[PDB]
Subunit: 309 residues, 6 copies
């Protein structure tokens, strides 16, 4: 699916740009924003076409509140600001964001150039609050050294987990995406043994194998993020997490980003993670990673997005 915006289902890339913006209270501002994002197809092709492979993609996310400024008329069944969490040890803040631009490509320059043109076309009408330059780290690993994104759904499985279906027909082909910008305590994670780290995660480190059911801690990241309803049905998200970092500031990050046809799934995951399940039995990953952002966006289908204003 080449150079079409709102392509939620794109495979992993070598490079990422994650841009979060807030819109000006102004009224021109509101409309300048709407021009840019309703015609996002323009800059996407403008940059993307310059690469033979056409690996460039761009998913636009709109915050719950800014959504009301440009379409009170109609509303996705499950749009809202990010539910903040305050558990026993660890907390997930709900930080601000009106616009999300999730940008992926085989090269940095392509990412940066798209971002540059999006930012420039918005001018004073919007301000960047968060900017992450994501990158592939070896054989699909996070900076914690684990293969990261393994159990993502694929193909038909993935469209079903991520894209709005018959259950909210006005926004079919849409999605809800939550981002969280995690920073890691490298020195603390390093005092653990590989085997302790594996227990924290749920999978072997080098080989990326899932631990047997009998050796699988009930507060391993994998168990906490497994969702099974009362009828026995699993519910999945699609995650496009990328590494990022700065050596001098000593930040080592996993940029979380998950898409689902219903954020309830992503939110239950986050609750099970921060509050724990049974309560207090939280996700040990949180001991070594602190979320610095937390934002929810609606991802309009291509039709819906081209309709704005």
């Amino acid at each position: 699916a080449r150079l079409a915006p709102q392509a939620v289902l794109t495979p992993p890339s070598a490079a990422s740009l994650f841009l979060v913006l807030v819109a000006g209270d102004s009224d021109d501002d509101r409309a300048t924003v709407c021009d840019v994002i309703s015609g996002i197809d323009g800059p996407l092709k403008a940059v993307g076409f310059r690469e033979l492979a056409g690996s460039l993609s761009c998913v636009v996310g709109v915050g719950a509140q800014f959504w009301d400024r440009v379409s009170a008329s109609s509303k996705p069944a499950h749009l809202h600001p990010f539910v903040p969490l305050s558990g026993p040890v660890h907390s997930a803040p709900s930080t601000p964001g009106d616009l999300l631009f999730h940008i992926k490509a085989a090269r940095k320059d392509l990412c940066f150039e798209l971002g540059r043109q999006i930012v420039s076309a918005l001018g004073s009408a919007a301000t960047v609050v968060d900017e992450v330059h994501g990158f592939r780290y070896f054989d699909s690993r996070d900076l914690l050294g684990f293969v990261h994104g393994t159990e993502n759904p694929t193909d038909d499985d993935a469209a079903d987990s991520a894209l709005i279906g018959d259950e909210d027909p006005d926004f079919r082909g849409g999605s809800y995406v939550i981002v969280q910008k995690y920073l890691h305590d490298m020195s603390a994670w390093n005092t653990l043994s590989t085997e302790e780290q594996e227990r924290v995660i749920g999978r072997t480190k080098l080989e990326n194998v899932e631990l047997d059911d009998d050796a699988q801690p009930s507060n391993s990241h994998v168990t906490l993020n497994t969702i099974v309803d009362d009828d026995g049905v699993e519910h999945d998200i699609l995650r496009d997490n990328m590494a990022f970092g700065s050596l001098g500031e000593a930040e080592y990050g996993t940029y979380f980003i998950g898409y689902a046809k219903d954020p309830a799934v992503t939110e239950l995951m986050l609750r099970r993670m921060f509050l724990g399940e049974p309560p207090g039995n939280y996700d040990r990953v949180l001991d070594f990673s602190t979320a610095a952002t937390g934002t929810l966006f609606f991802v309009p289908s291509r039709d819906v997005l081209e309709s704005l204003g």
Copy 2:
């Protein structure tokens, strides 16, 4: 997608070959031609299979006059010869051709080999009247220095624009293609400032950004080739342009090739370019580009192509 004839929707390639032939007068000649083109999947796979990536493709087009020689009592709704245009200084001639082979691949040798096997199969039953070896020029630029194919529709939109549908069910999935071989006057074009060149096209040169409405001349290539009907519905074509040339003869060219479900769109674009809108307000690209050919072909779907005879 993979090694199948009449794949009209293929992404851009690094190499292409455009062959235009005229069929012999005889009944033998007509039968040989029908054999070769209805069996086109043979040569296609025979060559294409030798490349792991499977990049090779071949779209066969048939001219209006040859179509009536072979399928008298069934005819796509809009098949007619290319309609020539005569402006005051610039003209679009209508030049011979019964067959088009539009061949694309990631490598020259593949395009060439297929062309060779095709020409060999037709033997004396057809004559090449035009042959162009297309190449990608840097970051998808034409020889005028502009990124070229940017606003091509993609994915679903491409299918809607290019492929015959419910209007003409007997030929669903076919298309209509028009070629024109343009030669540029590089001297004249170089005497223009970059900014003037950008005004001719309708986009910035290096950065490939559309000029905003208020800097966008009414006779820009972009403006004149934007087609909106009374209902306010935009109509697009699919373009597979490639650069070509010969240093010794001083030929620096752009092979135009456009696909449309209805050639009325392509024709309207052409007459806006050549005759202006308002009248006299013609496309300044034509001050720098001269068409040496103009042929229209019907592109049958696979099923229809295989039935010929």
Copy 3:
């Protein structure tokens, strides 16, 4: 179709791994195997996700005897063991196999790693009975020197040819696969002239162009493997052949692997090849190639495989 088990329609790859296993008798053996093959997407993603390109695929086949051991309740219409053929000169043995893993990827390491993990997970519950490491040879050639896979159906035609549809709706999206490990007599092949070899195959050698009607012998590999029904409709199979071998043991091989929605098409190709058409008019390719194995498997869709 990324990292999805039972992706029958994958394009050709640089590397592949063909694993044939016999399952143990015990009910525990039957259960371990079923647990492993039903969660096959686990290892497939555990290794496949590690490659940016996502080229890794894995198709699981199940033999007739073993299927009857896990789902006596419902059977695919055409599942039976491979049918031995015994012709005027050559024979196609029917050999054991309860499980097939047909693994493909852009790199050997990925194939090997998936195999390792699969075999480790099966433990004592199964035994590797045939193992062959296929590799692409120049411009899609086999070790006989011919471009090999040319006339595979593609896209819709491939799906129509290989995938089970309305004819057996309980097993929709599945397939039937037949494998045969062939070994060549290279010296005998080399005493033929190129033109002779071209007549055996049905296509020119370097340029991979089909011989025209009148230069085609009646017993050419191509002619014999052309299946046209009484209404004039051709019936195709999907072949993922790879080369293999061992220089020290002087083994130069072609691993035949053919998928079809109805294996009778594949079976008819085999009969016409081994017994000949008309009879005695057998495929001269068999004068240079000897199949060491012969096994038929049913390829369950994801849904059916997942619920085994």
Copy 4:
């Protein structure tokens, strides 16, 4: 020349890491530094070997002052701190730096990982003052849109321009490198026409051709950076400049980095640029770019560097 440190002559890469550090006044600090950099070969191979292509390289630079802390005994003929410049309009500061790590590879992750291991092995013994993540921007361009690095010397020509020869035999195979972290005024550069910009640079923008001798401004960047002595001999540097940037902070950068067997050449270039020649006739590039750092380092041959402490 694979995975050897102090490989000054490596071809351009897709990715860069530029790290500048200051050493602690301490004495352990001094020796921890010396372990790390004298055995730089260790981490270089440790990371580098993990990529089949072995594109990873790392040139270690030592500041004039820290050099005296670890080798008073012997000194390169031309080592000193960066000469700051204070011209009519524009100024080049001399900022601090003891250690330079110039890291190049085909991938980001390789760069980042090497940096991460270098930083971690230094611990409290050193502090990052400057960190630039350089990237290739299209067809070897800077963010000003010009092809950047064109006239670099190559092969034998490049070894002669950059590496210390018979003229200082104790440090044969060494080099002197100057870095400057330039930030651009995008909006101002954009108010220029392409043709004005070309006049500023010395070359055509899209085509990267050098302007004719008669149309070549005497204060074009090219003329100012051309060095010809009294006998008619040209003297060149080797430059490994990379783009870098941040969208939210609105910085758009060229990271300058030049190597020479004698910094006098680089320093004359900088003087001609900032002071102008004739004086006051300075480099118009400076109107659109401000140097935020300015540092000189000695680049020890592999032998000399392995000898430290």
Copy 5:
């Protein structure tokens, strides 16, 4: 050897461009040409730097007549115009050329762009007299179907073969290049059996293995092009052949281009090919290939080229 003019020893490329030009009579023409070719590294870097890989190369040759126009003062030992050969069946014409640009790169666009810039810079001062766009054909084949360039010397042997050394120290690091544009009779070639073609060339076709001593005809292309001196030392040239052609004009070509430190080696290969060894025993390759051009050029080192 990155973006350096006169890189004679570059490995094979996917694309190349062969430009032959005749210079104008005027002293201004002579000067413009000299300015352009002497600053050739300008355009070479102007386009070549734009590709990360740096695959672009450009070798400049100068004909004998034109050299005498710019440096009557000093001459390379072996520079003369190409010597026409007129044999019992075939002939090698000697055709005009003052300048050769032998351009190679991984992409056509780079070759084309370098050519464009060069030709633009020469303006009215020169005229393109032959232009051919070479391209790699499958696994290093020519349009006759044979792997083509196999026995090129490499590394030191290549430098010893191609580069001028102690024998003529004034032009050290230079070379002598001969080009001939050959066109094939494809139909005639196709009436030969593969074995017949193999005997013409001297090597097996698909597998590119040299025929042994006793199966080698005396007039095989390989045999005739083997140059052994009286001390038993072989003498090699460096050939950067590429395929080219035009389907409409039915042109299927091999562009011959051969470098040697002493062109007499190349010349002796030509005589032995066209007149045969023993005489009349000519190279049967010439029964299927006709040279449309024939030009010799001296390839100055960078230093000498830079000072022209």
Copy 6:
């Protein structure tokens, strides 16, 4: 470098083939062998030329016994059969082989094709006694999961370590190579913690970092294979390890192959590994790895190889 026999210094490859053969007793057999190996550049180019990149290489090695059959009155200074070792629990057997072909390429088919042409040329004059198809395993790891070839010397150091020099001028540019086919016990090795595995090797598993001296056991693979003489001069070998295996027979292997200008270094390494230092303090890798072969070969330079006969 390019398609030349005896290129000992080639960088790592994705595929390799190690063939070890025994020559026939006859004078015919000895002559055929001499023809094939002195003409090795034939097959090398015949296969290697078919790949644009020219990755294919072939290093021919000759055993001590066969050397005396063919070159009685000239002999490299240190050519002798492999010296077997017998430790208390682990042994290095000495196994037959007159010829080694060590073949590397970017693709299996190339290695295979060369092997095939070589075996075909020797016909009945030689028998294969060992054949191993090497493959790269992820990011240059062996089947034990460790990055493998890290501390291999590069560039000039590699030449100094691997290639015979002024010590033995008659054979300058030759080398001595030793092969051993090791099979691992994967069960035993898996029962170890990552940290224990790291202590066995001498480097961290995932990150491939050398353990600092104070955590580095005296019997680590790294420690035991570090060779420093009385003068304090380090002695290195060049290793071209590759993974190999068969799932069905449960073979998971490491093909050791080391090149040295003097096999005394390789032998000293081996006896430190197998017999310990101090005595009994053997390499724990051997608890998990068992050598099935052990053969030493002289690698003649090109000039010497071509002279055989």
